[PDB]
């Protein structure tokens, strides 16, 4: 009722749709959504190809009649293809009797969705993530795991937000949404790649105060408000993202659920920054946390 | 390499289970297996009952017509009832067709499972638990929220371990097997009910700092050993479970994976707890985490 945990949308609907992709012996994850398989387009490449490869030339070379494509162990024929962006879409001779109602979406950083980690079409676990302001995600993925998709849900509507593609030298990892475009600078090829220097999700960090004070820790509360542009000039010193009309807009709900304007929040975080924790605690912690949404605590905690 | 998350198992087997039981005014969450329907006995329970119910006499006042089970906007058909300790047993005509390879199991305090959190037959959220050593289990589950289940998934086979019936006034959550029998000294009453003291689960902080090294954190490591019983000594001070010889082997494959000795692990254990964390963070978290087990690692990290 207020254990603040982590909460993964539940995945049998993203289950019904996984499938495996084969080009040679390189078997990716695959999303089949009606009579369409959507995967990374990187299936297509051999070792030697990784490094820098021409997609456009890569494809040529490539027919229907090369692409396995399977639901467990049964194949699905490929009776048509096409490359848009970093996915391949496959058109397959059937339609998922499993197909949820579905879109696509492109999420903003700070967002939060879950992940069902794949491996060979087989699904091996959810985990909730969200979508850091350098737009690198701190997953879990091994070896195979690409074409794993992000998702949130919204009373039976699967909106998919996320596909696998990248691990960074820093441990994070990369990725598309489901028309190929990467979130952030990075590109599919087999190098070391740099992301931005990450930033804590400040409208995140107003969410869990929020859901503190509903639970009746609220030690840390002031009496002084600040403006908007003040806040976010002060949040950037201390590696903090601003703060957008959106993220005002969100915490609306929360605002008017404990009667605290979303400024006079940002000032008592503000104080939090500068003051450091005293010592003391919230909802048990020292560490602010900064991925849980507005969202998640109005659907977890009112 | 891996990174690492919080990891449920993918709940689409569990979803396709899920029904709603209401009896009078009373609605909650029941689990539909072949042609039963398993739920918490007190859906049979109205406000007066609550306080000292005799469920006994309460469920032979029933009849079959009494209950209403909707799969989602479908009535089955109640031919038959029986209670089992805690849980009601409602025999329906039609058997699930999505009823996967199943079996009941009373899990251990230390081992974690995944709850699919439900309300009005409907799947809401997934996420990781552990069974504490207090018998209690650390959840987000609201009013609605009882009949929701906890599982483990072993080879396509679904071991339900959990069955959601109480939250507890400190806002932690207590229930039963799926055989109707509490995990801990818990009744089935509408009153205020205390666990006993809760003690840390010692060979999943081991686990988790075994998680940790694997992803490069080890500021934490030192060059010591201590024995078992030395260990335990210090453990059992600072309220941590006694580490079995049981314990050392099952965390040998992450032993092995490391190249760090259970026993050196140990005494890099000893010194967090009594020299604390010094204003450093563990895999990103500042308290040392308990609800992975050596297992839970494993899969996840190789
Ligand atoms: C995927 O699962 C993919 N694996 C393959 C494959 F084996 C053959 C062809 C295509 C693909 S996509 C994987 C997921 C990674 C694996 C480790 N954890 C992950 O999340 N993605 C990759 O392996 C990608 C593949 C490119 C898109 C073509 N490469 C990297 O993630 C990658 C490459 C890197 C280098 O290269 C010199 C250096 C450092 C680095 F951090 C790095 N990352
Ligand atoms: C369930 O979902 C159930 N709800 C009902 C119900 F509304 C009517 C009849 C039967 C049931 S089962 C719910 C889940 C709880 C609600 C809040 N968060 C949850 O996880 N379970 C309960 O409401 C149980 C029911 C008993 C088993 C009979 N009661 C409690 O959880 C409960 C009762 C409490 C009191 O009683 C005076 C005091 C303090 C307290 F914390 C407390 N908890």
């Known amino acids: 009722g207020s254990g603040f945990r982590k909460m993964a949308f539940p995945s049998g609907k993203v289950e019904g749709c996984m499938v495996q992709v084969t080009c040679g012996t390189t078997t990716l994850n695959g999303l089949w959504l009606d009579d369409v398989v959507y995967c990374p387009r990187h299936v297509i490449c051999t070792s030697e190809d990784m490094l820098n490869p021409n997609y456009e030339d890569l494809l040529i070379r490539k027919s229907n009649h090369n692409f396995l494509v399977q639901a467990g162990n049964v194949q699905l024929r490929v009776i048509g293809h096409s490359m848009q962006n970093c996915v391949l879409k496959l058109k397959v001779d059937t339609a998922n009797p499993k197909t949820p109602k579905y879109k696509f979406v492109r999420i903003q950083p700070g967002q939060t969705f879950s992940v069902l980690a794949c491996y060979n079409g087989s699904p091996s676990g959810v985990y909730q993530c969200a979508m850091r302001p350098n737009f690198t995600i701190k997953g879990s993925f091994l070896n195979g795991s690409c074409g794993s998709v992000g998702f949130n849900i919204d009373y039976d509507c699967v909106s998919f937000c996320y596909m696998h593609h990248m691990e960074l030298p820093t441990g994070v990892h990369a990725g598309t949404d489901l028309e190929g475009n990467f979130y952030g600078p990075f590109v599919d090829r087999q190098t070391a790649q740099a992301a931005g220097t990450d930033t804590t999700i400040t409208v995140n960090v107003l969410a869990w105060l929020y859901a503190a004070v509903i639970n009746g820790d609220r030690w840390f509360l002031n009496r002084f408000?600040?403006?908007?542009?003040?806040?976010?000039?002060?949040?950037?010193?201390?590696?903090?993202?601003?703060?957008?009309?959106?993220?005002?807009?969100?915490l609306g709900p929360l605002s008017a659920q404990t009667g605290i304007a979303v400024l006079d929040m940002c000032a008592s975080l503000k104080e939090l920054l500068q003051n450091g924790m005293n010592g003391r605690t919230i909802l048990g912690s020292a560490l602010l946390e900064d991925e849980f949404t507005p969202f998640d605590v109005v659907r977890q905690c009112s």
Not at 225 to 250: G, S
């Open 225 to 250: 408000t600040t403006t908007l542009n003040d806040f976010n000039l002060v949040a950037m010193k201390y590696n903090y993202e601003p703060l957008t009309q959106d993220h005002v807009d969100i």
